[PDB]
Scaffold this active site. Structure first.
Site, PDB file in Angstrom:
ATOM      1  N   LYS A   1       5.889  -7.566  -1.081  1.00 12.89           N
ATOM      2  CA  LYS A   1       5.899  -7.485   0.093  1.00 12.89           C
ATOM      3  C   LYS A   1       5.907  -6.695   1.301  1.00 12.89           C
ATOM      4  O   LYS A   1       7.085  -8.098   1.869  1.00 12.89           O
ATOM      5  CB  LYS A   1       4.020  -7.617  -0.276  1.00 12.89           C
ATOM      6  CG  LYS A   1       3.243  -6.897  -1.738  1.00 12.89           C
ATOM      7  CD  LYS A   1       1.891  -7.300  -1.745  1.00 12.89           C
ATOM      8  CE  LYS A   1       1.275  -6.981  -3.496  1.00 12.89           C
ATOM      9  NZ  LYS A   1      -0.218  -6.888  -2.758  1.00 12.89           N
TER      10      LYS A   1
ATOM     11  N   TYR B   1      -0.713   1.465  -7.928  1.00 11.20           N
ATOM     12  CA  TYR B   1      -1.385   1.398  -7.239  1.00 11.20           C
ATOM     13  C   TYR B   1      -3.558   1.846  -8.283  1.00 11.20           C
ATOM     14  O   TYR B   1      -3.581   2.691  -7.486  1.00 11.20           O
ATOM     15  CB  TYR B   1      -2.220   0.353  -6.220  1.00 11.20           C
ATOM     16  CG  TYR B   1      -1.511  -0.912  -6.010  1.00 11.20           C
ATOM     17  CD1 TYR B   1      -0.634  -1.071  -5.237  1.00 11.20           C
ATOM     18  CD2 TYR B   1      -1.675  -2.017  -6.600  1.00 11.20           C
ATOM     19  CE1 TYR B   1       0.147  -1.949  -3.997  1.00 11.20           C
ATOM     20  CE2 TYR B   1      -1.640  -3.255  -6.128  1.00 11.20           C
ATOM     21  CZ  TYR B   1      -0.303  -3.198  -4.902  1.00 11.20           C
ATOM     22  OH  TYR B   1      -0.513  -4.296  -3.993  1.00 11.20           O
TER      23      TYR B   1
ATOM     24  N   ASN C   1      -0.694 -10.653   1.400  1.00 11.90           N
ATOM     25  CA  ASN C   1      -0.523 -11.631   0.239  1.00 11.90           C
ATOM     26  C   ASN C   1       1.219 -11.536  -1.039  1.00 11.90           C
ATOM     27  O   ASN C   1       0.685 -12.447  -1.628  1.00 11.90           O
ATOM     28  CB  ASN C   1      -2.284 -11.227  -0.618  1.00 11.90           C
ATOM     29  CG  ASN C   1      -1.720 -10.372  -1.731  1.00 11.90           C
ATOM     30  OD1 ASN C   1      -0.785  -9.767  -1.832  1.00 11.90           O
ATOM     31  ND2 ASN C   1      -3.123  -9.742  -2.151  1.00 11.90           N
TER      32      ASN C   1
ATOM     33  N   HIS D   1       2.957  -9.071  -5.561  1.00 10.52           N
ATOM     34  CA  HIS D   1       2.383  -8.440  -6.610  1.00 10.52           C
ATOM     35  C   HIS D   1       3.132  -8.997  -7.261  1.00 10.52           C
ATOM     36  O   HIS D   1       4.687  -9.333  -7.877  1.00 10.52           O
ATOM     37  CB  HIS D   1       3.086  -7.597  -6.500  1.00 10.52           C
ATOM     38  CG  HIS D   1       2.427  -6.477  -7.498  1.00 10.52           C
ATOM     39  ND1 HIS D   1       1.062  -6.341  -7.862  1.00 10.52           N
ATOM     40  CD2 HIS D   1       2.609  -5.725  -9.259  1.00 10.52           C
ATOM     41  CE1 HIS D   1       1.028  -5.596  -9.464  1.00 10.52           C
ATOM     42  NE2 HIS D   1       2.392  -5.615  -9.760  1.00 10.52           N
TER      43      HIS D   1
ATOM     44  N   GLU E   1       4.233  -0.677 -15.046  1.00  7.15           N
ATOM     45  CA  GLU E   1       4.778  -1.031 -13.654  1.00  7.15           C
ATOM     46  C   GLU E   1       6.592  -0.582 -13.345  1.00  7.15           C
ATOM     47  O   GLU E   1       6.497  -0.355 -12.528  1.00  7.15           O
ATOM     48  CB  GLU E   1       4.145  -2.084 -13.641  1.00  7.15           C
ATOM     49  CG  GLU E   1       3.105  -1.790 -12.661  1.00  7.15           C
ATOM     50  CD  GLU E   1       1.962  -3.348 -12.156  1.00  7.15           C
ATOM     51  OE1 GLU E   1       3.044  -4.149 -12.028  1.00  7.15           O
ATOM     52  OE2 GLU E   1       0.623  -3.419 -12.550  1.00  7.15           O
TER      53      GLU E   1
HETATM   54  C1  LIG Z   1      -9.365  -7.054  -4.596  1.00 10.97           C
HETATM   55  C2  LIG Z   1      -8.957  -6.025  -3.463  1.00 10.97           C
HETATM   56  C3  LIG Z   1      -7.588  -6.153  -3.625  1.00 10.97           C
HETATM   57  N1  LIG Z   1      -6.874  -5.571  -1.943  1.00 10.97           N
HETATM   58  C4  LIG Z   1      -5.677  -5.572  -2.293  1.00 10.97           C
HETATM   59  C5  LIG Z   1      -4.801  -6.290  -2.403  1.00 10.97           C
HETATM   60  C6  LIG Z   1      -4.175  -6.609  -3.205  1.00 10.97           C
HETATM   61  O1  LIG Z   1      -2.530  -7.480  -3.395  1.00 10.97           O
HETATM   62  C7  LIG Z   1      -4.564  -5.511  -4.467  1.00 10.97           C
HETATM   63  C8  LIG Z   1      -4.437  -5.301  -5.667  1.00 10.97           C
HETATM   64  O2  LIG Z   1      -5.694  -5.958  -5.733  1.00 10.97           O
HETATM   65  P1  LIG Z   1      -5.820  -7.353  -7.372  1.00 10.97           P
HETATM   66  O3  LIG Z   1      -5.322  -5.962  -8.433  1.00 10.97           O
HETATM   67  O4  LIG Z   1      -7.236  -7.568  -7.307  1.00 10.97           O
HETATM   68  O5  LIG Z   1      -5.038  -8.148  -6.679  1.00 10.97           O
HETATM   69  P2  LIG Z   1      -2.959  -8.785  -6.993  1.00 10.97           P
HETATM   70  O6  LIG Z   1      -2.744  -8.661  -6.131  1.00 10.97           O
HETATM   71  O7  LIG Z   1      -4.509 -10.523  -7.099  1.00 10.97           O
HETATM   72  O8  LIG Z   1      -3.459  -8.226  -8.777  1.00 10.97           O
HETATM   73  O9  LIG Z   1      -5.373  -4.816  -3.744  1.00 10.97           O
HETATM   74  C9  LIG Z   1      -7.774  -5.504  -0.955  1.00 10.97           C
HETATM   75  O10 LIG Z   1      -6.635  -4.771   0.532  1.00 10.97           O
HETATM   76  N2  LIG Z   1      -8.652  -6.354  -0.878  1.00 10.97           N
HETATM   77  C10 LIG Z   1      -9.747  -7.005  -1.468  1.00 10.97           C
HETATM   78  O11 LIG Z   1     -10.925  -6.285  -1.824  1.00 10.97           O
HETATM   79 MG   LIG Z   2      -2.818  -6.293  -9.624  1.00 12.11          MG
END
Ligand SMILES: Cc1cn([C@H]2C[C@H](O)[C@@H](COP(=O)(O)OP(=O)(O)O)O2)c(=O)[nH]c1=O
Ligand SMILES: [Mg+2]
Ligand SMILES: Cc1cn([C@H]2C[C@H](O)[C@@H](COP(=O)(O)OP(=O)(O)O)O2)c(=O)[nH]c1=O
Ligand SMILES: Cc1cn([C@H]2C[C@H](O)[C@@H](COP(=O)(O)OP(=O)(O)O)O2)c(=O)[nH]c1=O
Ligand SMILES: Cc1cn([C@H]2C[C@H](O)[C@@H](COP(=O)(O)OP(=O)(O)O)O2)c(=O)[nH]c1=O
Ligand SMILES: Cc1cn([C@H]2C[C@H](O)[C@@H](COP(=O)(O)OP(=O)(O)O)O2)c(=O)[nH]c1=O
Ligand SMILES: Cc1cn([C@H]2C[C@H](O)[C@@H](COP(=O)(O)OP(=O)(O)O)O2)c(=O)[nH]c1=O
Ligand SMILES: [Mg+2]
Ligand SMILES: [Mg+2]
Ligand SMILES: [Mg+2]
Ligand SMILES: [Mg+2]
Ligand SMILES: [Mg+2]
Lengths: 133, 133, 133, 133, 133, 133
Positions: free
Chosen positions: A9, A50, A113, A116, A127
């Site tokens: 990312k 997403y 974070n 992905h 995806e």
């Molecule tokens: C749950 C959550 C996700 N997100 C964003 C960051 C996540 O990487 C993305 C997709 O969420 P998710 O699919 O729950 O997480 P992951 O990336 O761990 O599979 O959405 C937020 O910005 N705020 C939030 O509260």
């Molecule tokens: Mg996810």
């Protein structure tokens, strides 16, 4: 064998962590099958990636962040690659991601974070088709 | 501000050194402007890339090695990127490459030497046009 | 193809640098052909190993240091292993050893200098015969 | 036995390289004798620190950079610490700093160059008196 | 945002792990707000820091250890910094601290355990006031 | 204090991970008491080491793998070394081994899993006697 879709990312580029993240996956012996670099991913592609989150309050902020800098999309291959790379990735929430995981060691935010990874066989197929039509 | 063309060679994939090498360049604050993954580069692109060496004794072995596994082609950007990344790369000859360089630390062969980097402004433009037409 | 004799010295055990040093040689693609651990090397083997230095002012201090903790003796194999591992090792004098070398990065003393490596084909054969009769 | 004055510069904080730099010095077996954290160093201390450069074209830009983020001032102690840490630091000019050095591996600018180290016995005493009165 | 108090304990200096520990926290994107180096912390300060342990059998041994070498005290700032840095730190007991944590990877003793981190909002305030009056 | 028996398996040599694995144990402050290098372990020794598995379907494949390249056998000593090194090792199954452990970070197969470590006081004694008669 499974194939999974990983995104490096924009925060990984800002913080010069691209190789650090890719290295953790490489050291676990997963092989790159396909890779693309995006100077800036089209917003529509991000919205498709997403799509399941389109009704969440964070959706627009998430899409803004994902187009704020480069992305690398990678297809990795290996036995049970989907679940294994998810465990290396670590939990989304910085209150939960475990030391030793990518997010546990390096990420301090729920949205910025770093990585992905596809979460299931069904979503990996989807995806991979988005990033590698 | 300059752009230079780097190849991560098949030996880097074999030895799981892809991120190690990319990370040395990333830590020096060079930025990826373009990047492509080749599961196997076409023979013709390799021969054009190394056209200067076409009449050398090692040419066929060099080309065979270069198509023996994946490569990554990367365009890096930064102030004086060409000379700076050449210095990081290290001498071709393992009897000469200095510790601290990529080849000095990690390569032990004149041919299986992990990384290509453009050697001049004109060759950078040429090589960028080959890999990123 | 050559073999060379390396000693990991007692200061490396004291400072928990054994794997750091072995890893620099491993990453250069040299292979272990023989290896022995000595909780304390016999004084006679040390004196024979350093027989060239027997009349030097530092000889007794050198031998005392060498029996002051464990050592590992390793035979490494690879193309031009002798000169290449000498270059990795770095200059004896901490005013001269170059950053990027083992001693340049990690050693700060002319005697407590972490690593021995054979300096020539003939001394390699000699030293291998001492540690691996 | 000598003491030298090191500054970890604002770019090291920006790029999260503070521990990387301190760790290179720590692994060389130099010891911290004093250390202070400055959220923002006073302009006057910077100008005194760099008093030799006060009439140079780059002086104001240098001072502005030095107050643009935090700095750490550290006094390191060890045998020949001054010259040894200068050698670790690397050349100011990114066209010259050698791979294996702090600046050779990590810095890509003549001004944003991560680390200051005293250049002589007399300047060490002077600089130590500025930062640790 | 929260602020938490971290101590780098004397065993970190003895074992040359200061930068390793600080680096793990820096890579998680926490920012230094204040930092002090202590060549030897006053015993009274240690007794105050650990006042809650004054009736435990280990109290005197703990205080002796804490004055046996240098300490660095650091205030780190970040969202939920207190609990996050506690999770990076790992459990006190070497039978429990998890691989991936600072103690899990690097500490092998219940007392010589490299790092202190505040355990709650209430104690962070108290400890910051002790080390940074 | 306990002593435990560790094997660095042939896949560690193939993948140039010997120092990486040994380093993780060294950084936890365990001490080498004995060490042997085997260019190829005798099959009978492998069969004895894994005698408890002789009726399992994987037994012959396991023995073939263990003689397919070098092994290093090491006796490590430390308080509660047996259980601690087992926790660093991580679970046999790549679906379970935790990020942060040796297998969790580096192994991707149930059999090519880089490292053996004794699992109890009773088996450490037995295994040490096999490798160090
Ligand atoms: C749950 C959550 C996700 N997100 C964003 C960051 C996540 O990487 C993305 C997709 O969420 P998710 O699919 O729950 O997480 P992951 O990336 O761990 O599979 O959405 C937020 O910005 N705020 C939030 O509260
Ligand atoms: Mg996810
Ligand atoms: C000089 C030389 C090169 N080669 C191969 C490996 C080199 O990477 C490639 C191109 O040579 P060259 O352009 O001289 O080296 P560099 O890669 O350092 O710019 O040719 C050999 O196989 N043998 C040789 O003797
Ligand atoms: C030259 C020299 C060596 N020694 C010790 C440390 C050296 O590792 C050892 C052998 O010397 P030498 O063979 O010159 O060095 P190297 O180890 O670099 O091949 O003798 C001293 O203690 N003092 C000295 O002045
Ligand atoms: C020579 C030079 C220095 N500087 C700044 C960065 C240097 O760290 C600082 C002091 O210069 P100098 O003492 O020459 O360098 P060093 O830091 O290697 O001892 O001045 C410039 O901005 N431009 C320049 O051309
Ligand atoms: C529980 C315990 C602590 N100590 C010392 C080391 C601990 O770091 C310190 C404070 O204990 P405690 O607050 O329980 O641990 P932590 O440091 O994980 O917050 O007391 C002992 O020496 N022996 C013991 O049995
Ligand atoms: C359980 C299992 C083990 N093995 C091999 C690899 C194991 O390292 C070895 C011994 O098994 P075991 O003692 O269960 O595992 P560990 O190595 O974690 O103590 O047997 C297989 O090849 N397949 C299997 O299904
Ligand atoms: Mg060339
Ligand atoms: Mg010699
Ligand atoms: Mg200067
Ligand atoms: Mg506590
Ligand atoms: Mg077992």
């Amino acid at each position: 064998l499974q194939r999974t879709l990983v995104l490096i990312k924009p925060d990984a580029f800002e913080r010069s962590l691209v190789a650090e993240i890719m290295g953790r996956i490489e050291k676990k012996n997963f092989k790159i099958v396909s890779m693309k670099f995006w100077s800036k991913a089209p917003r529509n592609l991000i919205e498709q990636h997403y799509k399941e989150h389109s009704e969440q309050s964070y959706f627009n902020d998430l899409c803004d962040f994902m187009v704020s800098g480069p992305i690398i999309s990678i297809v990795y291959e290996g036995t049970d690659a989907i679940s294994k790379i998810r465990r290396l990735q670590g939990n989304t929430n910085p209150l939960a991601s475990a030391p030793g995981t990518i997010r546990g060691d390096l990420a301090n935010d729920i949205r910025e974070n770093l990585i992905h990874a596809s979460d299931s066989e069904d979503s990996a197929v989807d995806e991979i088709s988005i990033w590698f039509p």
